[PDB]
Amino acid sequence: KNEHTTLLVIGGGPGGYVAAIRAGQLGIPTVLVERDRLGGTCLNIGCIPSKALIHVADAFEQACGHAGEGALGIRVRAPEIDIAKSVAWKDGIVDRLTRGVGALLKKSGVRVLHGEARVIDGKTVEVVSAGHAVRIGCEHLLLATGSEPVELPSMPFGGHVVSSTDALSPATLPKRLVVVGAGYIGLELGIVYRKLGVDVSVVEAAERVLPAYDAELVRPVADSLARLGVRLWLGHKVLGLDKHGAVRVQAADGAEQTLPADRVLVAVGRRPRVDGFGLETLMLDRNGRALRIDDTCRTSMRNVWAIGDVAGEPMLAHRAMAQGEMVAELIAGRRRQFMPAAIPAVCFTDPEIVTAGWSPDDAHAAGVDCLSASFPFAANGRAMTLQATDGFVRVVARRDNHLIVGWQAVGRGVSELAAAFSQSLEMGARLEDIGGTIHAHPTLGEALQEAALRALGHA
Amino acid sequence: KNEHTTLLVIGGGPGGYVAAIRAGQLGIPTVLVERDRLGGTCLNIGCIPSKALIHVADAFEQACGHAGEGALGIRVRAPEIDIAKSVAWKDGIVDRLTRGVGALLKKSGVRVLHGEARVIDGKTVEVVSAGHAVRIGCEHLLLATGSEPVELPSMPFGGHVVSSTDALSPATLPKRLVVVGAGYIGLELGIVYRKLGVDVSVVEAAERVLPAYDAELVRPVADSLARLGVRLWLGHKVLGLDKHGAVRVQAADGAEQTLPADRVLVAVGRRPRVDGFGLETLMLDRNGRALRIDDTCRTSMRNVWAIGDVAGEPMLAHRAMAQGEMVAELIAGRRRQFMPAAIPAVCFTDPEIVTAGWSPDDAHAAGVDCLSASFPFAANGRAMTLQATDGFVRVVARRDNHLIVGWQAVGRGVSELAAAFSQSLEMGARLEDIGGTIHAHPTLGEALQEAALRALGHALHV
Ligand SMILES: Cc1cc2nc3c(=O)[nH]c(=O)nc-3n(C[C@H](O)[C@H](O)[C@H](O)COP(=O)(O)OP(=O)(O)OC[C@H]3O[C@@H](n4cnc5c(N)ncnc54)[C@H](O)[C@@H]3O)c2cc1C
Ligand SMILES: Cc1cc2nc3c(=O)[nH]c(=O)nc-3n(C[C@H](O)[C@H](O)[C@H](O)COP(=O)(O)OP(=O)(O)OC[C@H]3O[C@@H](n4cnc5c(N)ncnc54)[C@H](O)[C@@H]3O)c2cc1C
Ligand SMILES: Cc1cc2nc3c(=O)[nH]c(=O)nc-3n(C[C@H](O)[C@H](O)[C@H](O)COP(=O)(O)OP(=O)(O)OC[C@H]3O[C@@H](n4cnc5c(N)ncnc54)[C@H](O)[C@@H]3O)c2cc1C
Ligand SMILES: NC(=O)c1ccc[n+]([C@@H]2O[C@H](COP(=O)([O-])OP(=O)(O)OC[C@H]3O[C@@H](n4cnc5c(N)ncnc54)[C@H](O)[C@@H]3O)[C@@H](O)[C@H]2O)c1
Numbered sequence: 001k002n003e004h005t006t007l008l009v010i011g012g013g014p015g016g017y018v019a020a021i022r023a024g025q026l027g028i029p030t031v032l033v034e035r036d037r038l039g040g041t042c043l044n045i046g047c048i049p050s051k052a053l054i055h056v057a058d059a060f061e062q063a064c065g066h067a068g069e070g071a072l073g074i075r076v077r078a079p080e081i082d083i084a085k086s087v088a089w090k091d092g093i094v095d096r097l098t099r100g101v102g103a104l105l106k107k108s109g110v111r112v113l114h115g116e117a118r119v120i121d122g123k124t125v126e127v128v129s130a131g132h133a134v135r136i137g138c139e140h141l142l143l144a145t146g147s148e149p150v151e152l153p154s155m156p157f158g159g160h161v162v163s164s165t166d167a168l169s170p171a172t173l174p175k176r177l178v179v180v181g182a183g184y185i186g187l188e189l190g191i192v193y194r195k196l197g198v199d200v201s202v203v204e205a206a207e208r209v210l211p212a213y214d215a216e217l218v219r220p221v222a223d224s225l226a227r228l229g230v231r232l233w234l235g236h237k238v239l240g241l242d243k244h245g246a247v248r249v250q251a252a253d254g255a256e257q258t259l260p261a262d263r264v265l266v267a268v269g270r271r272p273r274v275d276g277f278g279l280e281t282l283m284l285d286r287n288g289r290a291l292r293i294d295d296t297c298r299t300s301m302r303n304v305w306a307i308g309d310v311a312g313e314p315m316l317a318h319r320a321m322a323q324g325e326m327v328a329e330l331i332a333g334r335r336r337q338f339m340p341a342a343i344p345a346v347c348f349t350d351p352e353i354v355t356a357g358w359s360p361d362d363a364h365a366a367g368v369d370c371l372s373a374s375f376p377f378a379a380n381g382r383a384m385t386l387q388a389t390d391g392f393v394r395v396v397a398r399r400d401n402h403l404i405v406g407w408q409a410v411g412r413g414v415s416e417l418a419a420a421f422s423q424s425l426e427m428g429a430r431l432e433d434i435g436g437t438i439h440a441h442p443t444l445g446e447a448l449q450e451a452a453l454r455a456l457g458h459a
Numbered sequence: 460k461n462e463h464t465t466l467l468v469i470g471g472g473p474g475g476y477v478a479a480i481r482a483g484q485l486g487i488p489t490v491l492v493e494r495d496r497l498g499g500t501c502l503n504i505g506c507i508p509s510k511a512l513i514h515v516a517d518a519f520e521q522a523c524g525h526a527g528e529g530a531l532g533i534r535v536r537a538p539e540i541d542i543a544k545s546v547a548w549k550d551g552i553v554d555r556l557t558r559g560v561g562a563l564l565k566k567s568g569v570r571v572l573h574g575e576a577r578v579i580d581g582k583t584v585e586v587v588s589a590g591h592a593v594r595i596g597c598e599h600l601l602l603a604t605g606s607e608p609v610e611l612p613s614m615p616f617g618g619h620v621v622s623s624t625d626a627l628s629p630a631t632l633p634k635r636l637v638v639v640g641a642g643y644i645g646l647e648l649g650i651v652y653r654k655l656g657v658d659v660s661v662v663e664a665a666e667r668v669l670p671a672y673d674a675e676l677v678r679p680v681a682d683s684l685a686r687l688g689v690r691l692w693l694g695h696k697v698l699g700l701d702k703h704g705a706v707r708v709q710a711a712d713g714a715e716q717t718l719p720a721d722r723v724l725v726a727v728g729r730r731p732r733v734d735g736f737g738l739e740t741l742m743l744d745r746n747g748r749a750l751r752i753d754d755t756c757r758t759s760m761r762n763v764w765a766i767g768d769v770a771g772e773p774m775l776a777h778r779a780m781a782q783g784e785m786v787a788e789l790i791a792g793r794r795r796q797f798m799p800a801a802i803p804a805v806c807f808t809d810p811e812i813v814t815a816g817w818s819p820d821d822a823h824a825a826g827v828d829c830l831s832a833s834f835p836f837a838a839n840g841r842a843m844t845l846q847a848t849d850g851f852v853r854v855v856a857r858r859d860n861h862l863i864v865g866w867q868a869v870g871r872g873v874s875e876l877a878a879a880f881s882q883s884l885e886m887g888a889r890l891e892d893i894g895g896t897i898h899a900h901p902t903l904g905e906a907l908q909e910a911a912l913r914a915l916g917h918a919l920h921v
């Protein structure tokens with residue numbers, strides 16, 4: 001059974017399915033191959049499940065009266081959680097979203113193939129299923145195979161040691177949990193478990209949590225971990241398990257300690273999926289363990305494109321989707337299609353961190369003289385009505401023309417400011433534009449206007 | 460005891476204090492006068508208290524398992540609430556914020572006098588306190604006296620009949636509450652009480668609730684009112700109270716029932732404060748009950764300005780703040796750089812309603828040919844993870860050039876999208892701009908992008 005198409009997309013994740021949909025809507029014959037389930041990591045074992053379990057944990061924290069309910073005059077009595085049912089609810093959401101994706105692919109004229117794909121050459125792929133074996137030819141090959149968790153060499157995945165995947169579908173809650181990695185995945189999940197009554201410890205090699213973000217921005221997250229009772233082991237590397245199932249931890253000076261645990265989450269990073277499916281035959285230029293690409297997602301081989309996590313950092317769903325749309329547009333012969341100067345991100349810890357564009361340090365590294373100003377939520381009315389006064393909002397702008405080049409915010413319930421950050425950046429707003437924009441009262445968003453004005457005050 | 464300044468501000472509400480602060484920062488000698496408490500209505504008996512109580516109610520609803528906690532595998536035991544302590548908590552927030560306004564006024568070089576201010580003439584004022592009085596001359600007079608609740612003459616305030624003020628400082632929760640008027644104030648407070656276990660009935664003269672918003676936008680609020688248990692008496696006028704303390708209501712055809720009540724909230728509107736402080740002398744033109752002003756907040760008298768609620772609709776704090784800031788800047792000599800921007804608004808009912816710019820009806824009334832599209836939260840991944848799938852985001856844009864002229868949204872926890880809506884309108888975004896802007900996943904915000912593409916799809920259709 002020999003087949004042919006114009007665009008062959010390997011991987012049914014955000015990058016892949018969004019790319020295929022747009023392609024189909026543009027009239028490009030397209031075939032999408034997916035070994036597991038449509039939606040990839042993002043829907044099945046990443047974004048949605050984590051955000052779903054974060055909602056359960058926040059809801060359980062509040063029910064327990066651990067989110068300051070007493071101060072409001074609400075005297076509570078201990079609730080109970082059936083984690084299996086929490087996970088089943090989360091799975092229901094994932095079910096509804098996958099079908100929606102599947103139906104959207106159908107409506108766009110894309111033919112989905114359920115199978116494991118092996119690349120034979122730049123314009124030929126073998127798709128293997130339960131007994132099937134078809135060979136598909138193509139004009140364009142779009143690689144969007146994503147990524148997988150990085151396994152610690154001294155402590156592999158199995159038994160008590162798990163990845164984010166199993167952490168998102170627990171059958172039971174453990175008494176003690178040790179998390180390796182104070183990145184956004186390890187902390188988001190670490191906090192989920194802590195709010196659910198689990199004794200949680202985090203092990204990070206860097207001098208502080210969330211090393212990818214600057215110091216000022218992370219401080220309110222550190223404080224929160226302190227109040228929540230999460231034990232932090234900063235400047236410590238994991239050497240492996242001992243006989244009693246405890247995690248051996250080594251400090252900078254050399255002296256070691258062991259943290260007991262009946263469950264260990266390793267969240268040290270993510271590795272691009274480039275091995276095991278004949279990608280060797282193409283011999284594509286590499287950028288670390290990821291496929292090298294130019295700013296239009298083209299690889300070193302003509303008509304072989306790469307998007308999403310398989311094309312490196314930043315490993316975000318919206319970035320993969322935006323990249324996929326750009327590729328579909330190019331194949332359809334459309335010009336003027338560029339990736340934006342700034343990609344927003346939200347880290348769903350408590351408090352949350354939201355960023356778009358440059359931080360003050362990123363602005364100095366790029367050789368641009370910039371001023372910045374922040375406004376604390378401690379002086380924002382809305383924040384006080386929500387009992388969420390920690391954190392702040394920061395604006396970053398060029399000193400010469402006041403063009404905004406970055407936004408950062410840390411606080412509870414600040415995630416939805418992300419849209420204001422990326423849209424203002426996409427429009428090229430200046431401090432004066434924001435300073436002059438009337439913001440609804442009372443809102444957390446008012447802090448954006450105040451930050452801009454404060455930057456114009458000590459300008 | 461005669462004293463002098465350049466700018467004399469009557470009222471320490473959002474308009475007055477923001478104006479005095481700005482003016483002070485710009486080096487203008489300023490005197491602000493407040494008869495009661497700094498922060499005005501917004502901080503002491505309006506914006507903040509209502510949002511605070513809405514937080515308490517939401518916390519209680521959630522503690523009781525009335526917001527779908529069972530579906531998340533969480534089994535709860537019923538909580539109890541000490542409402543006096545809820546009010547004390549709220550008054551604490553209010554008090555902290557008022558002292559913040561006080562400290563900022565001092566740090567800005569403003570001289571704050573506590574007392575009743577009376578107009579002698581356009582350039583002179585009298586500030587009276589307990590055994591103290593001063594005549595103060597000014598070059599510019601800023602009137603920012605605010606608003607007051609409208610009292611039904613056929614059911615005056617007293618005893619069981621309360622205004623928003625007492626409803627925001629209850630000593631006890633009533634068994635049955637009747638709310639008159641289904642405006643944003645009446646519904647916000649109606650919902651607070653209902654979530655706290657009170658039987659609530661709302662009486663409204665208009666055909667539906669929140670009559671100032673379009674039907675499609677308020678439909679999810681009416682559905683939520685039904686889910687919550689709030690009884691709605693639509694197309695009904697409140698006549699008065701019978702001997703039993705019940706509310707006598709009259710339908711359109713003439714028929715009439717009585718709603719048993721042990722507490723009645725009258726939220727039929729708000730009125731500008733223009734009487735009892737010497738304004739009559741100044742023959743200032745009037746816009747209905749309010750003071751008439753041009754787009755720069757100038758009254759018909761020279762160097763007499765008016766801002767905020769005393770200057771009519773829309774009665775919102777951020778508008779008052781904007782106007783107060785504009786006035787200070789004009790007196791300082793700085794010309795205006797941005798034209799009066801769109802005035803957003805957030806209705807904190809459950810679900811919430813957020814709006815900025817024009818709705819499809821407003822656009823047609825202004826004579827601008829527009830199209831619009833919506834995207835439901837029922838299809839949004841973030842919304843599903845938050846158990847907030849009712850509602851939608853709608854974008855409104857000009858058919859000729861795709862410039863967005865308005866945004867509306869209805870859903871649980873959509874208030875913070877206000878920044879995005881307000882900032883995009885001020886920048887002049889087109890459907891294309893939003894459509895091609897990356898939005899973080901997973902967020903409610905992604906619906907804005909999806910809505911813009913929906914609309915753009917129609918605009919570019921054969
Ligand atoms: C716990 C966790 C939380 C996260 N939270 C967020 C968040 O809040 N926001 C955010 O933006 N990002 C988040 N991410 C990252 C996000 O999931 C990824 O950036 C996104 O999934 C990348 O999409 P993709 O299409 O590039 O790859 P993937 O989503 O991994 O899709 C790749 C797909 O291709 C298939 N595939 C691979 N090789 C083959 C082959 N040879 N043949 C056939 N099929 C193949 C796989 O089965 C897979 O389904 C999170 C990740 C994790 C692990
Ligand atoms: C229940 C409720 C909820 C609300 N919620 C919101 C909301 O969520 N968002 C929003 O934007 N708006 C809201 N508002 C509206 C908001 O409170 C008003 O729009 C805002 O307070 C108007 O500000 P202002 O400065 O015009 O007048 P005010 O805030 O009323 O301040 C006027 C001040 O002037 C003083 N004063 C009057 N006469 C004299 C005199 N002769 N001498 C000295 N002092 C004097 C008064 O004591 C008062 O302090 C709400 C209102 C109510 C009633
Ligand atoms: C039936 C009726 C008669 C009126 N008569 C007079 C008058 O004689 N003199 C005068 O100066 N002004 C009168 N008004 C105007 C009133 O005092 C307010 O100024 C006006 O309702 C403000 O409405 P709004 O658009 O600002 O809505 P909001 O202030 O946002 O909300 C107030 C809501 O209360 C409702 N409402 C008002 N009165 C009643 C009532 N009796 N029963 C149930 N609901 C009610 C309104 O329909 C409105 O939806 C009347 C209004 C109504 C509806
Ligand atoms: N006693 C009741 O339970 C009752 C009776 C009628 C209507 N309603 C309510 O009013 C709404 C409209 O129903 P409809 O089309 O049959 O009536 P309608 O629109 O024809 O008018 C309402 C009439 O029913 C009477 N009434 C009695 N209880 C009422 C209540 N709780 N709310 C409003 N009106 C009430 C009024 O006197 C009025 O004449 C419904 O949503 C319903 O919940 C309730």
Ligand SMILES: Cc1cc2nc3c(=O)[nH]c(=O)nc-3n(C[C@H](O)[C@H](O)[C@H](O)COP(=O)(O)O)c2cc1C
Pocket residue numbers: 609610611612613727
């Ligand atoms: C300032 C003002 C506001 C009023 N607001 C209302 C109102 O909201 N609803 C209403 O039914 N009647 C309102 N009325 C009038 C009442 O219908 C009143 O019962 C009727 O006009 C009789 O007035 P009288 O007692 O002066 O004769 C208002 C009157 C005034 C002066």
Ligand SMILES: Nc1ncnc2c1ncn2[C@@H]1O[C@H](COP(=O)(O)OP(=O)(O)O)[C@@H](O)[C@H]1O
Pocket residue numbers: 150151152153180181182183184185186204205206210211212237267268269270
């Ligand atoms: N390939 C790898 N092998 C072993 N350890 C790794 C690897 N990649 C990263 N780490 C470890 O992970 C820790 C950093 O984790 P984290 O800050 O969570 O990163 P990320 O945010 O990328 O997940 C460090 O201790 C680092 O040494």
Ligand SMILES: [Cl-]
Pocket residue numbers: 325894895
């Ligand atoms: Cl696009």
